[PDB]
Design a protein around this ligand. Structure first.
Ligand SMILES: Nc1ncnc2c1ncn2[C@@H]1O[C@H](COP(=O)(O)OP(=O)(O)OP(=O)(O)O)[C@@H](O)[C@H]1O
Ligand SMILES: [Mg+2]
Ligand SMILES: [Mg+2]
Lengths: 985, 76, 147, 75
């Protein structure tokens, strides 16, 4: 009973069973500051049964540094009371409550307990009870640029899925008598040692088809072993194998035991000596707070730092830690004790929310057990950070001034950023910018662009939008919401509904870009990313890229004149199937789904467009005849969609659907078997239907079968929609109409000058004149997966399952069909939060203008297995041109709008290079091998005139530059690369 | 010398190399064991992304070292 | 992209292939029109076939998109001009050039492969009644590839 | 010496070879006997796929060894 209209993207990450079990779990959250509220938001969006908050502390001003559900009118009110009302709106299925008193026994009501901003003694008191009652306990902490997470799910945690990957499946060629299984040609099983697999449809070894899992010994990328199968047979041919994933038993240790000898999880292998330091530092922080009436060390205070270091040494001696304490790092932790950054809060909130989902669903591998993280490279160095500048000023940014200072706050407030896209990452980025006070100064400004509209399925991870906001524009809603969150941003956000691309350069031109400070991409396709990257490279602006997929995420930074661009690296391309496999010989459900999609498009989209275009253009016939690869099929489509097979009622639609069923599932298979009989052999004597080719069988229509009826209903409904007739749904009419059907005879054909033209003319004159049909138009069927009342996914599923029945392939349900046909990208809220946190941690580095490449970090992570990694960006390549050092990416030539001959002479004279090719856009302006007459014609013209002539289109009024790519040779004839040319118009 | 490469999807790969081997040889071995073209492979060790043209000794990679094979994601 | 295409075009210009002629249409570097001469020892002998080659932005990394324009009676070519080729697919990587593709298409013209066909009826004719296939191919080339 | 090669269809082909013979020569013999192009041949012995440029001795193939021959399906 899961609402698939809301959790559509999340179910592809977790699953039906996982969410079913998750929806019966209770979560308690202690602490409602930025980290606590972030965790609560992620949990509420995830869909647990309920959430309870406990935080009786009165609100203070500095708490607004990272709490986006608190306003300056709520000072002096308990945080839980003022946060629950706003949290209850995120998800209608997740009630949110507040408890004003916490007793130990009460903890028995909850499946998971999350603890933040609580002293260590209370944490020990809670854990001593939660450990022995089998209650998941998660404790999180965020101090300035440092963070810690601790997980304890009990001594007998059972993990059903470990890596979160789909089970591997494959087709076997042969199984020897010693269990040596071999895959088909150029196919990798991908298994590891110790895995379990089960076989099916194996010929010659029926014993392996029972279903008993067996061990796997990977002997190579294409072959593996399972052991001895002597008794079950001698050799096995063909068959399929599927991986079996077995549960794992994980044992956690209580907090009291874990303090003595922790087990760390390292987010960065470049600094493996720090977590031992942080373990002492955080305990020293807790002890210091307990020894000063719950007061953290004052920012950048030397006396407090010395006392904190004394506490650290005392703890190190007490715990018998054989580590040498690094005074600088520990005192850095002491200085930033009162810091409260929204970026760290978002990062840790995403991580902890994922851990909570793991605890409730018993899925994925959790952290075991300590996770200490820092981003100390983000501390500004171009401003004065001292005790006098980091003191609080009684404003809402105190939690950030305590780390960065007032001068860096002024630097942040003067940013002029540009955010592309307003998806989930866009919403998180806007929230972080609002909290950080970005562009709240006199010279600040924010611009956001996105052309999409809010849909129901977007509410699962885009928290700035509400069900009342469905149908509106994403940019407007996000801008309004963030203006509500931070009133200082009112009138400093501009929202556009324009798509960023080659057709929108009139708005995002030179004037727009020359005033920016950085560009942040929040897109979901590679083309737009590359376009924005090229624009940023041309204008020399920092760029921040980020991407998510299910539980995986990555973030990258592009810095002018320092690092390489986004487009200097490759990514794996999308896989497409060969046309021959899809057309006649499928062997996977994906092939049938693709074929069903093509059938849908060809039945309900293309003929309608042809008919409409014929009725619109007065002379469409000539264009169709002289342009279409198959004009006669176009004429046939027009004829049989206008006159011959035009329906007049719904019964005719049902009969048409039956006829199409016969055409596509009974006759084509008979023709194929006539061409390639089941007993046929290839040229080498081997049977034709062996291996990846499966012998099909015709389908005889049977009304009692569910799939046949589903296909008939879907096809009839879509045809009626095309012709705009009323469509019935009661099966009685379908049974009555289809009962009295007499199939025409069919016999496969064996095959065997000016007649074709005669037939074309006969068809042409049979068509009624367009004059006789004025105002009559047919509605094409535009594919739309997200709507469940249009019979699109139903038709695709029915056709795919019928074709699978033709070729003996296991059919897929509607869920998987929707996933495959719609090309849905799995998405999650936790991954979005983590990537936004990382990007905002890089943003402060960009603002400070760090000039060294060892200070920036590109991040990759996978939350399913708890993997984090960071790596420095790749420096832009250099080269030598005319005895000078030239950056390959960020350098360009600035030339006036001079003649082509003058350009060639300039290059020959200054650089000593001979120009051989000069192109602009996708046109070849000048080439060395062109005939002399053409060059003489094109030589004395200016560059702008040459471009206008070649492209046969005038330059736009707003064009202020031209980007030309030039290939030139040196004096010796050796090709030398040169940077592009920026002609100034 | 034996090294381990961990994929972003959780898979682990064992490679037999020598200190003098270049990054291109390692990428070729990874392609052989996985089919990933060398131009699309992103190897990270100790916070440094390995670049073509250099040797393992340049990155101080020793026996039982751990590398991470990562990739970029198009969603978001 | 543009530099790679220009390099390949210059290379083609240096040495005339004598069996193929590919060049940009109009001035669009990413759209080419190529000509292939039918192999002498084949049913398609004495024929000129025009192909349209749309280039990919990621070239040479991504593969080109070749389509036949002249009607041809071949088991691996359908009525839309699609080509069932391997060096136009997974077998292809950024190591070969358009000249290789044109030679490969000429070879595929030289000897069809009916074991994995794209037009089942033509493959059936080719396997069963070779002479009828030869006659049909010659007639189709004569009436479509000449003139 | 003599070796046996078994196909996916149960056919067994006997070959007279020497331990020093290259894999390419064996593939040429298979092409002569069956017409299968060497590029499409994939020979497996003791769970290892034979590769071009090597010899049978490199794979420890000895008297009356049994190999498996699987061919690829070109697209
Ligand atoms: N070229 C582009 N220019 C501007 N905005 C773009 C461009 N391409 C995509 N976007 C926007 O980027 C956002 C991508 O975010 P996301 O993919 O999470 O949302 P969605 O596509 O609406 O959702 P879903 O993929 O779940 O159906 C969307 O707002 C999309 O409109
Ligand atoms: Mg959308
Ligand atoms: Mg999207």
């Amino acid at each position: 009973t899961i609402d698939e209209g809301l959790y559509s993207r999340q179910l592809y990450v977790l699953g039906h069973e996982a969410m079913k079990q998750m929806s019966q779990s209770n979560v308690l959250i202690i602490g409602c500051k930025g980290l606590g509220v972030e965790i609560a938001k992620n949990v509420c969006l995830a869909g647990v049964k309920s959430v309870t908050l406990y935080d009786p502390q009165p609100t203070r001003i500095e708490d607004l540094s990272s709490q986006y559900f608190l306003t300056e009118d709520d000072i002096g009110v308990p945080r839980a009371k003022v946060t629950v009302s706003k949290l209850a709106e995120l998800n209608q299925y997740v009630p949110v409550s507040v408890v004003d008193e916490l007793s130990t026994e009460y903890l028995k009501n909850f499946k998971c307990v999350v603890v933040t901003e609580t002293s260590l003694t209370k944490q020990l008191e809670i854990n001593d009870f939660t450990h022995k009652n089998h209650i998941a306990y998660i404790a999180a902490d965020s101090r300035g640029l440092f963070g810690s997470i601790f997980c304890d799910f009990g001594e007998n945690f059972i993990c059903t899925d470990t890596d979160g990957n789909e089970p591997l499946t494959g087709m076997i060629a042969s199984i020897t008598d010693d269990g040596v299984v071999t895959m088909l040609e150029e196919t990798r099983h991908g298994l590891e040692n110790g895995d379990f697999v089960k076989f099916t449809e194996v010929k010659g070894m029926p014993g392996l088809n029972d279903g008993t899992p067996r061990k796997v010994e990977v002997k190579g990328p294409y072959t593996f072993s399972i052991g001895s199968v002597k008794d079950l047979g001698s050799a096995g041919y063909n068959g399929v194998f599927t991986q079996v994933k077995v549960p794992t038993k994980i044992s956690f240790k209580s907090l009291r035991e874990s303090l003595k000898d922790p087990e760390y999880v390292y987010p960065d292998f470049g600094k493996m000596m720090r977590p031992p330091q942080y373990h002492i530092a955080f305990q020293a922080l807790s002890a210091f707070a307990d020894a000063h009436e719950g007061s953290l060390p004052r920012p950048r205070n030397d006396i407090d730092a010395a006392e904190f270091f004394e506490f650290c040494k005392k703890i190190a001696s007490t715990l018998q830690f054989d580590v040498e304490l690094d005074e600088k790092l520990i005192k850095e932790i002491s200085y930033q004790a009162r810091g409260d950054l929204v970026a760290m809060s978002a990062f840790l909130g995403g991580a902890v929310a994922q851990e909570v989902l793991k605890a409730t669903t018993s899925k994925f591998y959790p952290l075991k057990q300590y996770f200490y993280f820092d981003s100390l490279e983000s501390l500004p160095s171009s401003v004065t950070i001292s005790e006098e500048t980091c003191k609080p000023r009684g404003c809402r940014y105190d939690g950030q001034i305590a780390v960065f200072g007032s001068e860096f706050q002024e630097k942040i407030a003067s940013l002029s950023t540009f955010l592309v896209g307003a998806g989930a990452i866009g919403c998180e980025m806007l929230k972080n910018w609002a909290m950080m006070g970005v562009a709240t100064g006199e010279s600040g400004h924010i611009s956001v662009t996105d052309m999409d509209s809010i849909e129901k399925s977007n509410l699962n991870r885009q928290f700035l939008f509400r069900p009342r906001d469905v149908g509106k524009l994403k940019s407007e809603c996000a801008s309004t919401a963030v203006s509500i969150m931070n009133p200082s941003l009112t009138g400093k956000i501009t929202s556009y509904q324009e798509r960023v691309g080659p057709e929108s350069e009139g708005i995002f031109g030179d004037e727009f870009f020359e005033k920016l400070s950085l560009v942040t991409n929040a897109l979901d396709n590679v083309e737009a990313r590359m376009y924005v990257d090229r624009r940023c490279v041309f204008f020399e602006k920092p760029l921040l890229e980020s991407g998510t997929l299910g539980t995986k995420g990555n973030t990258q930074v592009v810095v002018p004149h320092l690092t390489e661009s986004y487009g200097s690296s490759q990514d794996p391309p999308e896989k497409s199937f060969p046309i021959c496999t899809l057309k006649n010989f499928p062997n996977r459900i994906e092939h049938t789904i693709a074929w069903a999609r093509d059938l849908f498009e060809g039945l309900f989209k293309q003929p309608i467009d042809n008919v409409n275009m014929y009725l619109s253009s007065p002379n469409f016939l000539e264009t169709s005849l002289k342009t279409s690869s198959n004009p006669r099929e176009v004429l046939e489509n027009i004829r049989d969609y206008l006159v011959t097979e035009k329906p007049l009622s719904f019964e005719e639609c049902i009969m048409w659907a039956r006829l199409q069923f016969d055409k596509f599932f009974n006759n084509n298979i008979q023709q194929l078997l006539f061409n390639f009989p089941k007993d046929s052999v290839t040229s080498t004597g081997q049977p034709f239907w062996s291996g990846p080719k499966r012998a099909p069988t015709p389908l005889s229509f049977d009304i009692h079968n569910r799939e046949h009826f589903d296909f008939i209903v879907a096809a009839a409904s879509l045809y009626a929609f095309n012709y705009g007739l009323k469509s019935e749904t009661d099966p009685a009419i379908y049974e009555r109409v289809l009962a009295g059907y007499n199939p025409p005879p069919f016999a496969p054909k064996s095959g065997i000058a000016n007649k074709d033209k005669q037939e074309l003319k006969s068809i042409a004159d049979s068509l009624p004149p367009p004059s006789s049909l004025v105002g009559f138009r047919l509605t094409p069927a535009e594919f739309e997966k997200d709507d469940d009342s249009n019979h699109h996914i139903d038709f695709i599923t029915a056709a795919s399952n019928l074709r699978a029945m033709n070729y003996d392939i296991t059919p897929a349900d509607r869920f998987k069909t929707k996933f495959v046909a719609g090309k849905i990208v799995p998405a999650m809220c936790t991954s979005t939060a983590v990537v936004s946190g990382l990007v905002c941690l890089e943003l402060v580095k960009l603002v400070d203008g760090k000039k060294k490449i060892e200070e920036y970090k590109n991040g990759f992570f996978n939350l399913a297995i708890g993997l984090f990694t960071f790596s420095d960006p790749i420096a832009s390549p250099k080269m030598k041109v005319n005895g000078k050092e030239i950056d390959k990416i960020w350098d360009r030539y600035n030339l006036p709008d001079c003649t082509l001959q003058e350009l060639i002479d300039y290059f020959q004279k200054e650089e000593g290079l001979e120009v051989t090719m000069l192109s602009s856009g996708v046109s070849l302006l000048y080439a060395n091998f062109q005939p002399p007459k053409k060059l003489a014609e094109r030589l004395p013209l200016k560059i702008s005139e040459l471009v206008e002539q070649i492209t046969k289109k005038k330059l736009e009024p707003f064009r202020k530059h031209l980007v030309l790519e030039i290939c030139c040779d040196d004096a010796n004839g050796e090709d030398v690369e040169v940077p592009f040319i920026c002609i100034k118009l | 010398m034996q090294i381990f490469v961990k994929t972003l999807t959780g898979k682990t790969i064992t490679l037999e190399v020598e200190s003098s081997d270049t990054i291109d040889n390692v990428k070729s071995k990874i392609q052989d064991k996985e089919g990933i073209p060398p131009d699309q492979q992103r190897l990270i060790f100790a916070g440094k992304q390995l670049e073509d043209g250099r040797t393992l000794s340049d990155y101080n990679i020793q026996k039982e070292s751990t590398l991470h094979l990562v990739l970029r994601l198009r969603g978001g | 992209a543009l530099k790679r295409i220009n390099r390949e075009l210059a290379d083609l210009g240096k040495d005339p292939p004598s069996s193929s002629s590919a060049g940009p249409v109009g001035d669009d570097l990413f759209h080419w029109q190529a000509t292939i001469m039918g192999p002498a020892d084949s049913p398609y002998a004495g024929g000129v076939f025009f192909l349209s080659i749309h280039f990919p932005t990621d070239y040479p990394f991504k593969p080109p998109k070749v389509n036949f324009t002249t009607r041809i009676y071949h088991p691996n070519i359908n009525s839309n001009g699609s080509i069932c080729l391997d060096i136009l697919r997974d077998q292809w990587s950024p190591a070969l050039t358009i000249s290789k593709v044109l030679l490969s298409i000429s070879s595929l013209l030289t000897d069809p492969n009916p074991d994995d066909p794209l037009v089942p009826e033509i493959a059936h004719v080719y396997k069963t009644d070779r002479s009828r296939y030869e006659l049909s191919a010659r007639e189709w080339t004569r009436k479509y590839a000449i003139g």
